[PDB]
Amino acid sequence: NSKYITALKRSEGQLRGIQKMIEGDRDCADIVTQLTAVRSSVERVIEMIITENLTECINQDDSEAQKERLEKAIRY
Amino acid sequence: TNSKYITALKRSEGQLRGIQKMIEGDRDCADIVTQLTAVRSSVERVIEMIITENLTECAQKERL
Amino acid sequence: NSKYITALKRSEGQLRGIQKMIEGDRDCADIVTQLTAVRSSVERVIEMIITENLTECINQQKERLEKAIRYLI
Amino acid sequence: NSKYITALKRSEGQLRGIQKMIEGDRDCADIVTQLTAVRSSVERVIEMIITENLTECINQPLDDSEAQKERLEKAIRYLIK
């Protein structure tokens, strides 16, 4: 649980860093590179919740477990 | 053009604080996945707007 | 088992058609959307084989558990 | 573009491979190992067409400037797909 808190705190702080870069008129490729890392850290939190939710979801839903399986095959 | 993207990332920054409050109060994790997917999409929208901002008047900035 | 002849044979003719489209020097957006359709239907066949594997372990045991650790590589 | 053609031929041919692994009933962790292999070869073809299209869009641009923002369409497909 609190793993996901600290990871989302990292993503929140990185978005504050990117705001300070846009304020500093930093280069748009440097902006896009850091925004890309934020996108990836949020997706990593999504992957970790869907992994944990699958591994208790098979020990038990309805047809929302196919969403979890769809997600894991698409990320694979 | 700066404050446009500042405001959009301030909105995403606060949505990540909201999702931390959702995790701390133990909500259904479909709701959490949906909100994080909205955060990822609003970040992707800012990426897309910045890239199509400069490549009209672009030298070289790229990404994968 | 023999449900999935048809989606895979469709994905075969789909990839043959993309080969003709690239041969026909046809538009790139059309080519990558037909390729994403291939990849999605192959993913859907993966998804159905995983899902009916996961139901078949329920009403009969490590076989659910290394199905779970398959999805997480 | 024969470089794409060889990889799509490998993809069709082991799709026949997966189909005739269903026509043995080979049990199915090995057929989804092979289906995963098909999926990732099609995805690395998709990524290759998309990058060399993107460097075609930037490096060899259209003479209509407003129609050269089909940069916008390849960037939106790059991001959300």
PDB file of C-alpha atoms in Angstrom:
ATOM      1  CA  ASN A   1       0.000   0.000   0.000  1.00  0.00           C
ATOM      2  CA  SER A   2       2.495   2.653   1.195  1.00  0.00           C
ATOM      3  CA  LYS A   3       4.925   1.625  -1.586  1.00  0.00           C
ATOM      4  CA  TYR A   4       2.426   3.150  -4.007  1.00  0.00           C
ATOM      5  CA  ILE A   5       2.263   6.311  -1.820  1.00  0.00           C
ATOM      6  CA  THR A   6       6.032   6.936  -1.972  1.00  0.00           C
ATOM      7  CA  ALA A   7       6.167   6.184  -5.728  1.00  0.00           C
ATOM      8  CA  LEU A   8       3.334   8.621  -6.449  1.00  0.00           C
ATOM      9  CA  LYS A   9       5.054  11.182  -4.233  1.00  0.00           C
ATOM     10  CA  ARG A  10       8.142  10.787  -6.511  1.00  0.00           C
ATOM     11  CA  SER A  11       5.946  11.379  -9.604  1.00  0.00           C
ATOM     12  CA  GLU A  12       4.317  14.443  -7.930  1.00  0.00           C
ATOM     13  CA  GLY A  13       7.735  15.941  -7.095  1.00  0.00           C
ATOM     14  CA  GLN A  14       8.979  15.267 -10.653  1.00  0.00           C
ATOM     15  CA  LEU A  15       5.982  17.164 -12.057  1.00  0.00           C
ATOM     16  CA  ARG A  16       6.968  20.067  -9.772  1.00  0.00           C
ATOM     17  CA  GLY A  17      10.488  19.809 -11.242  1.00  0.00           C
ATOM     18  CA  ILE A  18       9.099  19.948 -14.783  1.00  0.00           C
ATOM     19  CA  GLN A  19       6.993  23.041 -13.967  1.00  0.00           C
ATOM     20  CA  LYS A  20      10.190  24.731 -12.714  1.00  0.00           C
ATOM     21  CA  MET A  21      11.911  23.773 -16.000  1.00  0.00           C
ATOM     22  CA  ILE A  22       9.080  25.299 -18.107  1.00  0.00           C
ATOM     23  CA  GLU A  23       9.345  28.398 -15.878  1.00  0.00           C
ATOM     24  CA  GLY A  24      13.113  28.371 -16.543  1.00  0.00           C
ATOM     25  CA  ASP A  25      12.433  28.136 -20.350  1.00  0.00           C
ATOM     26  CA  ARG A  26      14.352  24.882 -20.489  1.00  0.00           C
ATOM     27  CA  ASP A  27      14.571  23.062 -23.808  1.00  0.00           C
ATOM     28  CA  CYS A  28      11.431  21.222 -24.970  1.00  0.00           C
ATOM     29  CA  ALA A  29      13.342  17.950 -25.541  1.00  0.00           C
ATOM     30  CA  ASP A  30      14.564  18.085 -21.915  1.00  0.00           C
ATOM     31  CA  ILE A  31      10.941  18.807 -20.857  1.00  0.00           C
ATOM     32  CA  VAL A  32       9.607  15.851 -22.952  1.00  0.00           C
ATOM     33  CA  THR A  33      12.321  13.504 -21.586  1.00  0.00           C
ATOM     34  CA  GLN A  34      11.321  14.264 -17.969  1.00  0.00           C
ATOM     35  CA  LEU A  35       7.551  14.091 -18.782  1.00  0.00           C
ATOM     36  CA  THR A  36       8.277  10.689 -20.374  1.00  0.00           C
ATOM     37  CA  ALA A  37       9.855   9.528 -17.111  1.00  0.00           C
ATOM     38  CA  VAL A  38       6.716  10.713 -15.201  1.00  0.00           C
ATOM     39  CA  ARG A  39       4.448   8.828 -17.632  1.00  0.00           C
ATOM     40  CA  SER A  40       6.562   5.727 -17.064  1.00  0.00           C
ATOM     41  CA  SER A  41       6.526   6.041 -13.244  1.00  0.00           C
ATOM     42  CA  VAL A  42       2.694   6.403 -13.238  1.00  0.00           C
ATOM     43  CA  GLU A  43       2.384   3.381 -15.593  1.00  0.00           C
ATOM     44  CA  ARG A  44       4.690   1.420 -13.241  1.00  0.00           C
ATOM     45  CA  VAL A  45       2.303   2.223 -10.345  1.00  0.00           C
ATOM     46  CA  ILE A  46      -0.653   1.056 -12.528  1.00  0.00           C
ATOM     47  CA  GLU A  47       1.242  -2.185 -13.308  1.00  0.00           C
ATOM     48  CA  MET A  48       1.964  -2.828  -9.639  1.00  0.00           C
ATOM     49  CA  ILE A  49      -1.678  -2.335  -8.598  1.00  0.00           C
ATOM     50  CA  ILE A  50      -2.976  -4.565 -11.440  1.00  0.00           C
ATOM     51  CA  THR A  51      -0.345  -7.228 -10.554  1.00  0.00           C
ATOM     52  CA  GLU A  52      -1.306  -7.202  -6.835  1.00  0.00           C
ATOM     53  CA  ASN A  53      -5.040  -7.095  -7.711  1.00  0.00           C
ATOM     54  CA  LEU A  54      -4.629 -10.096 -10.052  1.00  0.00           C
ATOM     55  CA  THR A  55      -2.747 -12.121  -7.444  1.00  0.00           C
ATOM     56  CA  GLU A  56      -5.566 -11.717  -4.952  1.00  0.00           C
ATOM     57  CA  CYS A  57      -8.220 -11.692  -7.738  1.00  0.00           C
ATOM     58  CA  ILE A  58      -7.521 -15.300  -8.714  1.00  0.00           C
ATOM     59  CA  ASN A  59      -7.992 -16.255  -5.028  1.00  0.00           C
ATOM     60  CA  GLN A  60     -11.262 -14.417  -5.282  1.00  0.00           C
ATOM     61  CA  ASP A  61     -14.449 -11.877  -9.700  1.00  0.00           C
ATOM     62  CA  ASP A  62     -16.774 -11.214 -12.648  1.00  0.00           C
ATOM     63  CA  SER A  63     -15.560 -10.210 -16.176  1.00  0.00           C
ATOM     64  CA  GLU A  64     -13.244  -7.454 -14.842  1.00  0.00           C
ATOM     65  CA  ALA A  65     -10.378  -9.997 -14.401  1.00  0.00           C
ATOM     66  CA  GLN A  66     -10.058  -9.978 -18.209  1.00  0.00           C
ATOM     67  CA  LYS A  67      -9.143  -6.262 -17.879  1.00  0.00           C
ATOM     68  CA  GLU A  68      -6.232  -7.310 -15.635  1.00  0.00           C
ATOM     69  CA  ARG A  69      -5.185 -10.068 -18.076  1.00  0.00           C
ATOM     70  CA  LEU A  70      -5.546  -7.676 -21.097  1.00  0.00           C
ATOM     71  CA  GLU A  71      -3.332  -5.162 -19.260  1.00  0.00           C
ATOM     72  CA  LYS A  72      -0.593  -7.712 -18.443  1.00  0.00           C
ATOM     73  CA  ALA A  73      -0.484  -9.141 -21.988  1.00  0.00           C
ATOM     74  CA  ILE A  74      -0.405  -5.626 -23.507  1.00  0.00           C
ATOM     75  CA  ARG A  75       2.491  -4.627 -21.184  1.00  0.00           C
ATOM     76  CA  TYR A  76       4.277  -7.969 -21.892  1.00  0.00           C
TER      77      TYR A  76
ATOM     78  CA  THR B   1       2.956  29.687 -23.830  1.00  0.00           C
ATOM     79  CA  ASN B   2       4.530  28.491 -20.588  1.00  0.00           C
ATOM     80  CA  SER B   3       1.723  28.905 -18.072  1.00  0.00           C
ATOM     81  CA  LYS B   4      -0.663  26.737 -20.128  1.00  0.00           C
ATOM     82  CA  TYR B   5       1.610  23.744 -19.540  1.00  0.00           C
ATOM     83  CA  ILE B   6       2.420  24.827 -15.932  1.00  0.00           C
ATOM     84  CA  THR B   7      -1.343  24.812 -15.161  1.00  0.00           C
ATOM     85  CA  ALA B   8      -1.896  21.389 -16.817  1.00  0.00           C
ATOM     86  CA  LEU B   9       0.966  19.826 -14.845  1.00  0.00           C
ATOM     87  CA  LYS B  10      -0.270  21.516 -11.628  1.00  0.00           C
ATOM     88  CA  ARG B  11      -3.628  19.753 -12.307  1.00  0.00           C
ATOM     89  CA  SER B  12      -1.823  16.381 -12.757  1.00  0.00           C
ATOM     90  CA  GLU B  13       0.341  17.010  -9.654  1.00  0.00           C
ATOM     91  CA  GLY B  14      -2.784  17.531  -7.575  1.00  0.00           C
ATOM     92  CA  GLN B  15      -4.468  14.469  -9.153  1.00  0.00           C
ATOM     93  CA  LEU B  16      -1.476  12.427  -7.900  1.00  0.00           C
ATOM     94  CA  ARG B  17      -2.112  13.857  -4.406  1.00  0.00           C
ATOM     95  CA  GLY B  18      -5.786  12.815  -4.745  1.00  0.00           C
ATOM     96  CA  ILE B  19      -4.781   9.264  -5.756  1.00  0.00           C
ATOM     97  CA  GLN B  20      -2.454   9.045  -2.714  1.00  0.00           C
ATOM     98  CA  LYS B  21      -5.508   9.941  -0.584  1.00  0.00           C
ATOM     99  CA  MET B  22      -7.491   7.169  -2.369  1.00  0.00           C
ATOM    100  CA  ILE B  23      -4.699   4.601  -1.598  1.00  0.00           C
ATOM    101  CA  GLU B  24      -4.451   5.756   2.057  1.00  0.00           C
ATOM    102  CA  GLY B  25      -8.194   5.366   2.439  1.00  0.00           C
ATOM    103  CA  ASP B  26      -8.160   1.926   0.819  1.00  0.00           C
ATOM    104  CA  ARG B  27     -10.521   2.554  -2.174  1.00  0.00           C
ATOM    105  CA  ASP B  28     -11.419   0.100  -4.908  1.00  0.00           C
ATOM    106  CA  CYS B  29      -8.406  -0.260  -7.071  1.00  0.00           C
ATOM    107  CA  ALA B  30     -10.340  -0.078 -10.354  1.00  0.00           C
ATOM    108  CA  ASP B  31     -11.153   3.529  -9.317  1.00  0.00           C
ATOM    109  CA  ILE B  32      -7.440   4.076  -8.546  1.00  0.00           C
ATOM    110  CA  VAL B  33      -6.348   2.574 -11.910  1.00  0.00           C
ATOM    111  CA  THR B  34      -8.870   4.824 -13.716  1.00  0.00           C
ATOM    112  CA  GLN B  35      -7.562   7.952 -11.959  1.00  0.00           C
ATOM    113  CA  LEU B  36      -3.867   7.093 -12.600  1.00  0.00           C
ATOM    114  CA  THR B  37      -4.796   6.443 -16.245  1.00  0.00           C
ATOM    115  CA  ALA B  38      -6.286   9.940 -16.369  1.00  0.00           C
ATOM    116  CA  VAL B  39      -3.002  11.298 -14.876  1.00  0.00           C
ATOM    117  CA  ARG B  40      -0.945   9.408 -17.497  1.00  0.00           C
ATOM    118  CA  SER B  41      -3.215  10.756 -20.275  1.00  0.00           C
ATOM    119  CA  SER B  42      -2.987  14.354 -19.109  1.00  0.00           C
ATOM    120  CA  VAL B  43       0.845  14.013 -18.976  1.00  0.00           C
ATOM    121  CA  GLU B  44       0.690  12.532 -22.537  1.00  0.00           C
ATOM    122  CA  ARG B  45      -1.438  15.477 -23.675  1.00  0.00           C
ATOM    123  CA  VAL B  46       1.213  17.925 -22.384  1.00  0.00           C
ATOM    124  CA  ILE B  47       3.955  15.868 -24.183  1.00  0.00           C
ATOM    125  CA  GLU B  48       1.893  16.015 -27.394  1.00  0.00           C
ATOM    126  CA  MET B  49       1.170  19.770 -27.123  1.00  0.00           C
ATOM    127  CA  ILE B  50       4.866  20.627 -26.455  1.00  0.00           C
ATOM    128  CA  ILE B  51       6.127  18.491 -29.394  1.00  0.00           C
ATOM    129  CA  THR B  52       3.618  19.909 -31.865  1.00  0.00           C
ATOM    130  CA  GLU B  53       4.303  23.391 -30.498  1.00  0.00           C
ATOM    131  CA  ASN B  54       7.956  23.359 -31.492  1.00  0.00           C
ATOM    132  CA  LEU B  55       8.000  21.147 -34.637  1.00  0.00           C
ATOM    133  CA  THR B  56       5.849  23.688 -36.465  1.00  0.00           C
ATOM    134  CA  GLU B  57       8.662  26.251 -36.003  1.00  0.00           C
ATOM    135  CA  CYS B  58      11.583  23.816 -35.790  1.00  0.00           C
ATOM    136  CA  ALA B  59      17.930  22.411 -34.193  1.00  0.00           C
ATOM    137  CA  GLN B  60      16.857  18.966 -33.402  1.00  0.00           C
ATOM    138  CA  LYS B  61      14.525  17.932 -30.596  1.00  0.00           C
ATOM    139  CA  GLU B  62      13.322  14.303 -30.716  1.00  0.00           C
ATOM    140  CA  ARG B  63      12.155  11.441 -28.604  1.00  0.00           C
ATOM    141  CA  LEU B  64      11.188   7.911 -28.894  1.00  0.00           C
TER     142      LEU B  64
ATOM    143  CA  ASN C   1      -8.780 -25.465 -28.640  1.00  0.00           C
ATOM    144  CA  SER C   2     -10.446 -25.499 -32.089  1.00  0.00           C
ATOM    145  CA  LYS C   3     -12.252 -22.219 -31.387  1.00  0.00           C
ATOM    146  CA  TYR C   4      -8.932 -20.488 -32.160  1.00  0.00           C
ATOM    147  CA  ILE C   5      -8.305 -21.755 -35.700  1.00  0.00           C
ATOM    148  CA  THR C   6     -10.114 -18.804 -37.188  1.00  0.00           C
ATOM    149  CA  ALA C   7      -8.689 -15.769 -35.406  1.00  0.00           C
ATOM    150  CA  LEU C   8      -5.152 -17.045 -36.071  1.00  0.00           C
ATOM    151  CA  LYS C   9      -5.970 -17.822 -39.744  1.00  0.00           C
ATOM    152  CA  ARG C  10      -7.484 -14.315 -39.961  1.00  0.00           C
ATOM    153  CA  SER C  11      -4.238 -12.920 -38.512  1.00  0.00           C
ATOM    154  CA  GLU C  12      -2.300 -14.913 -41.145  1.00  0.00           C
ATOM    155  CA  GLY C  13      -4.253 -13.443 -44.058  1.00  0.00           C
ATOM    156  CA  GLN C  14      -4.066 -10.078 -42.269  1.00  0.00           C
ATOM    157  CA  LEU C  15      -0.224 -10.236 -42.267  1.00  0.00           C
ATOM    158  CA  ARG C  16      -0.230 -11.372 -45.934  1.00  0.00           C
ATOM    159  CA  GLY C  17      -2.384  -8.326 -46.714  1.00  0.00           C
ATOM    160  CA  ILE C  18       0.008  -6.014 -44.893  1.00  0.00           C
ATOM    161  CA  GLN C  19       2.851  -7.525 -46.960  1.00  0.00           C
ATOM    162  CA  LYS C  20       0.847  -6.646 -50.112  1.00  0.00           C
ATOM    163  CA  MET C  21       0.182  -3.136 -48.719  1.00  0.00           C
ATOM    164  CA  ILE C  22       3.895  -2.550 -48.167  1.00  0.00           C
ATOM    165  CA  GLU C  23       4.477  -4.034 -51.657  1.00  0.00           C
ATOM    166  CA  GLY C  24       1.770  -1.682 -52.947  1.00  0.00           C
ATOM    167  CA  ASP C  25       3.623   1.259 -51.295  1.00  0.00           C
ATOM    168  CA  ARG C  26       0.386   2.149 -49.531  1.00  0.00           C
ATOM    169  CA  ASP C  27      -0.087   4.728 -46.715  1.00  0.00           C
ATOM    170  CA  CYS C  28       1.848   4.216 -43.521  1.00  0.00           C
ATOM    171  CA  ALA C  29      -1.039   4.973 -41.125  1.00  0.00           C
ATOM    172  CA  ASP C  30      -3.144   2.324 -42.900  1.00  0.00           C
ATOM    173  CA  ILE C  31      -0.233  -0.164 -42.576  1.00  0.00           C
ATOM    174  CA  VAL C  32       0.360   0.417 -38.863  1.00  0.00           C
ATOM    175  CA  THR C  33      -3.381   0.265 -38.033  1.00  0.00           C
ATOM    176  CA  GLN C  34      -3.686  -3.094 -39.811  1.00  0.00           C
ATOM    177  CA  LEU C  35      -0.545  -4.279 -37.961  1.00  0.00           C
ATOM    178  CA  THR C  36      -2.064  -3.122 -34.622  1.00  0.00           C
ATOM    179  CA  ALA C  37      -5.188  -5.137 -35.544  1.00  0.00           C
ATOM    180  CA  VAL C  38      -2.926  -8.245 -36.026  1.00  0.00           C
ATOM    181  CA  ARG C  39      -1.199  -7.676 -32.706  1.00  0.00           C
ATOM    182  CA  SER C  40      -4.488  -7.044 -30.870  1.00  0.00           C
ATOM    183  CA  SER C  41      -6.126 -10.236 -32.175  1.00  0.00           C
ATOM    184  CA  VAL C  42      -3.022 -12.293 -31.273  1.00  0.00           C
ATOM    185  CA  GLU C  43      -3.259 -10.647 -27.807  1.00  0.00           C
ATOM    186  CA  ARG C  44      -6.957 -11.600 -27.659  1.00  0.00           C
ATOM    187  CA  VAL C  45      -6.102 -15.245 -28.410  1.00  0.00           C
ATOM    188  CA  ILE C  46      -3.440 -15.055 -25.616  1.00  0.00           C
ATOM    189  CA  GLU C  47      -6.084 -13.508 -23.310  1.00  0.00           C
ATOM    190  CA  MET C  48      -8.698 -16.231 -23.971  1.00  0.00           C
ATOM    191  CA  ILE C  49      -6.176 -19.089 -23.506  1.00  0.00           C
ATOM    192  CA  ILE C  50      -4.976 -17.493 -20.185  1.00  0.00           C
ATOM    193  CA  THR C  51      -8.590 -16.874 -19.049  1.00  0.00           C
ATOM    194  CA  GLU C  52      -9.994 -20.355 -19.729  1.00  0.00           C
ATOM    195  CA  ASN C  53      -6.811 -21.805 -18.216  1.00  0.00           C
ATOM    196  CA  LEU C  54      -7.674 -19.711 -15.127  1.00  0.00           C
ATOM    197  CA  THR C  55     -11.308 -20.886 -15.020  1.00  0.00           C
ATOM    198  CA  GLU C  56     -10.269 -24.523 -15.607  1.00  0.00           C
ATOM    199  CA  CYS C  57      -8.040 -24.499 -12.520  1.00  0.00           C
ATOM    200  CA  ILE C  58     -10.932 -23.087 -10.434  1.00  0.00           C
ATOM    201  CA  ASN C  59     -13.331 -26.047 -10.691  1.00  0.00           C
ATOM    202  CA  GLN C  60     -10.539 -28.520 -10.212  1.00  0.00           C
ATOM    203  CA  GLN C  61      -2.460 -27.460  -7.419  1.00  0.00           C
ATOM    204  CA  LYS C  62       0.391 -25.146  -8.595  1.00  0.00           C
ATOM    205  CA  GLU C  63      -1.178 -24.710 -12.044  1.00  0.00           C
ATOM    206  CA  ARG C  64      -3.087 -21.554 -11.162  1.00  0.00           C
ATOM    207  CA  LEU C  65      -0.036 -20.178  -9.371  1.00  0.00           C
ATOM    208  CA  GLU C  66       2.526 -20.430 -12.170  1.00  0.00           C
ATOM    209  CA  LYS C  67      -0.194 -19.166 -14.504  1.00  0.00           C
ATOM    210  CA  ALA C  68      -0.192 -16.122 -12.181  1.00  0.00           C
ATOM    211  CA  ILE C  69       3.619 -15.799 -12.329  1.00  0.00           C
ATOM    212  CA  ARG C  70       3.447 -16.198 -16.152  1.00  0.00           C
ATOM    213  CA  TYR C  71       1.645 -12.844 -16.526  1.00  0.00           C
ATOM    214  CA  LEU C  72       4.292 -10.818 -14.615  1.00  0.00           C
ATOM    215  CA  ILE C  73       7.560 -11.285 -16.560  1.00  0.00           C
TER     216      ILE C  73
ATOM    217  CA  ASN D   1      10.610  -2.425 -48.126  1.00  0.00           C
ATOM    218  CA  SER D   2      11.734  -6.103 -47.945  1.00  0.00           C
ATOM    219  CA  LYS D   3      13.110  -5.614 -44.405  1.00  0.00           C
ATOM    220  CA  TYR D   4       9.546  -5.506 -43.128  1.00  0.00           C
ATOM    221  CA  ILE D   5       8.497  -8.322 -45.513  1.00  0.00           C
ATOM    222  CA  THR D   6      10.852 -10.991 -44.033  1.00  0.00           C
ATOM    223  CA  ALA D   7       9.676 -10.320 -40.469  1.00  0.00           C
ATOM    224  CA  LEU D   8       5.995 -10.449 -41.463  1.00  0.00           C
ATOM    225  CA  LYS D   9       6.693 -13.733 -43.305  1.00  0.00           C
ATOM    226  CA  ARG D  10       8.319 -15.188 -40.114  1.00  0.00           C
ATOM    227  CA  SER D  11       5.184 -13.991 -38.258  1.00  0.00           C
ATOM    228  CA  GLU D  12       2.694 -15.711 -40.643  1.00  0.00           C
ATOM    229  CA  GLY D  13       4.741 -18.892 -40.720  1.00  0.00           C
ATOM    230  CA  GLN D  14       4.906 -19.368 -37.008  1.00  0.00           C
ATOM    231  CA  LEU D  15       1.216 -18.420 -36.868  1.00  0.00           C
ATOM    232  CA  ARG D  16       0.795 -21.645 -38.942  1.00  0.00           C
ATOM    233  CA  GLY D  17       3.156 -23.111 -36.336  1.00  0.00           C
ATOM    234  CA  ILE D  18       0.798 -22.125 -33.490  1.00  0.00           C
ATOM    235  CA  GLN D  19      -2.240 -23.380 -35.455  1.00  0.00           C
ATOM    236  CA  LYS D  20      -0.713 -26.815 -35.992  1.00  0.00           C
ATOM    237  CA  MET D  21       0.375 -26.841 -32.353  1.00  0.00           C
ATOM    238  CA  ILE D  22      -3.347 -26.487 -31.687  1.00  0.00           C
ATOM    239  CA  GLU D  23      -3.828 -29.363 -34.180  1.00  0.00           C
ATOM    240  CA  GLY D  24      -1.728 -31.622 -31.910  1.00  0.00           C
ATOM    241  CA  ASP D  25      -3.244 -30.158 -28.823  1.00  0.00           C
ATOM    242  CA  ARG D  26       0.163 -29.230 -27.580  1.00  0.00           C
ATOM    243  CA  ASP D  27      -0.663 -27.861 -24.123  1.00  0.00           C
ATOM    244  CA  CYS D  28      -0.929 -24.280 -24.081  1.00  0.00           C
ATOM    245  CA  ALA D  29       1.802 -22.538 -22.093  1.00  0.00           C
ATOM    246  CA  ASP D  30       4.044 -23.417 -25.020  1.00  0.00           C
ATOM    247  CA  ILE D  31       1.508 -22.103 -27.548  1.00  0.00           C
ATOM    248  CA  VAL D  32       1.226 -18.789 -25.676  1.00  0.00           C
ATOM    249  CA  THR D  33       5.018 -18.647 -25.495  1.00  0.00           C
ATOM    250  CA  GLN D  34       4.868 -18.826 -29.298  1.00  0.00           C
ATOM    251  CA  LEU D  35       1.896 -16.393 -29.519  1.00  0.00           C
ATOM    252  CA  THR D  36       3.794 -13.934 -27.301  1.00  0.00           C
ATOM    253  CA  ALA D  37       6.727 -14.328 -29.744  1.00  0.00           C
ATOM    254  CA  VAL D  38       4.393 -13.462 -32.685  1.00  0.00           C
ATOM    255  CA  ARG D  39       2.988 -10.464 -30.772  1.00  0.00           C
ATOM    256  CA  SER D  40       6.420  -9.018 -29.950  1.00  0.00           C
ATOM    257  CA  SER D  41       7.766  -9.491 -33.506  1.00  0.00           C
ATOM    258  CA  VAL D  42       4.683  -7.666 -34.869  1.00  0.00           C
ATOM    259  CA  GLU D  43       5.161  -4.915 -32.241  1.00  0.00           C
ATOM    260  CA  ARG D  44       8.859  -4.391 -33.106  1.00  0.00           C
ATOM    261  CA  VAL D  45       7.821  -4.157 -36.802  1.00  0.00           C
ATOM    262  CA  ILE D  46       5.190  -1.504 -35.707  1.00  0.00           C
ATOM    263  CA  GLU D  47       7.880   0.415 -33.810  1.00  0.00           C
ATOM    264  CA  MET D  48      10.275   0.286 -36.776  1.00  0.00           C
ATOM    265  CA  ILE D  49       7.663   1.554 -39.339  1.00  0.00           C
ATOM    266  CA  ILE D  50       6.647   4.289 -36.897  1.00  0.00           C
ATOM    267  CA  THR D  51      10.235   5.626 -36.284  1.00  0.00           C
ATOM    268  CA  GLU D  52      11.237   5.588 -39.967  1.00  0.00           C
ATOM    269  CA  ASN D  53       7.899   7.235 -40.810  1.00  0.00           C
ATOM    270  CA  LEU D  54       8.593   9.889 -38.158  1.00  0.00           C
ATOM    271  CA  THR D  55      12.020  10.582 -39.612  1.00  0.00           C
ATOM    272  CA  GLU D  56      10.353  10.635 -43.066  1.00  0.00           C
ATOM    273  CA  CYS D  57       7.887  13.254 -41.704  1.00  0.00           C
ATOM    274  CA  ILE D  58      10.672  15.409 -40.252  1.00  0.00           C
ATOM    275  CA  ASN D  59      13.505  14.805 -42.731  1.00  0.00           C
ATOM    276  CA  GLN D  60      11.489  14.726 -46.015  1.00  0.00           C
ATOM    277  CA  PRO D  61       8.643  17.181 -45.369  1.00  0.00           C
ATOM    278  CA  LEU D  62       5.655  17.975 -47.559  1.00  0.00           C
ATOM    279  CA  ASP D  63       5.589  21.161 -49.617  1.00  0.00           C
ATOM    280  CA  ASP D  64       2.177  22.063 -48.246  1.00  0.00           C
ATOM    281  CA  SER D  65       2.999  23.274 -44.733  1.00  0.00           C
ATOM    282  CA  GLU D  66      -0.526  22.791 -43.361  1.00  0.00           C
ATOM    283  CA  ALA D  67      -0.519  19.261 -44.735  1.00  0.00           C
ATOM    284  CA  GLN D  68       2.974  18.798 -43.257  1.00  0.00           C
ATOM    285  CA  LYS D  69       1.149  18.857 -39.924  1.00  0.00           C
ATOM    286  CA  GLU D  70       0.405  15.275 -40.426  1.00  0.00           C
ATOM    287  CA  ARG D  71       3.314  15.551 -38.005  1.00  0.00           C
ATOM    288  CA  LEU D  72       0.439  16.044 -35.504  1.00  0.00           C
ATOM    289  CA  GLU D  73      -1.211  12.799 -36.583  1.00  0.00           C
ATOM    290  CA  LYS D  74       1.985  10.718 -36.313  1.00  0.00           C
ATOM    291  CA  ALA D  75       2.796  12.301 -32.942  1.00  0.00           C
ATOM    292  CA  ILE D  76      -0.716  11.544 -31.578  1.00  0.00           C
ATOM    293  CA  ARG D  77      -0.418   7.907 -32.829  1.00  0.00           C
ATOM    294  CA  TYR D  78       3.128   7.778 -31.325  1.00  0.00           C
ATOM    295  CA  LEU D  79       1.805   8.776 -27.914  1.00  0.00           C
ATOM    296  CA  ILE D  80      -1.668   7.231 -27.521  1.00  0.00           C
ATOM    297  CA  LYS D  81      -2.044   3.792 -29.169  1.00  0.00           C
TER     298      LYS D  81
END
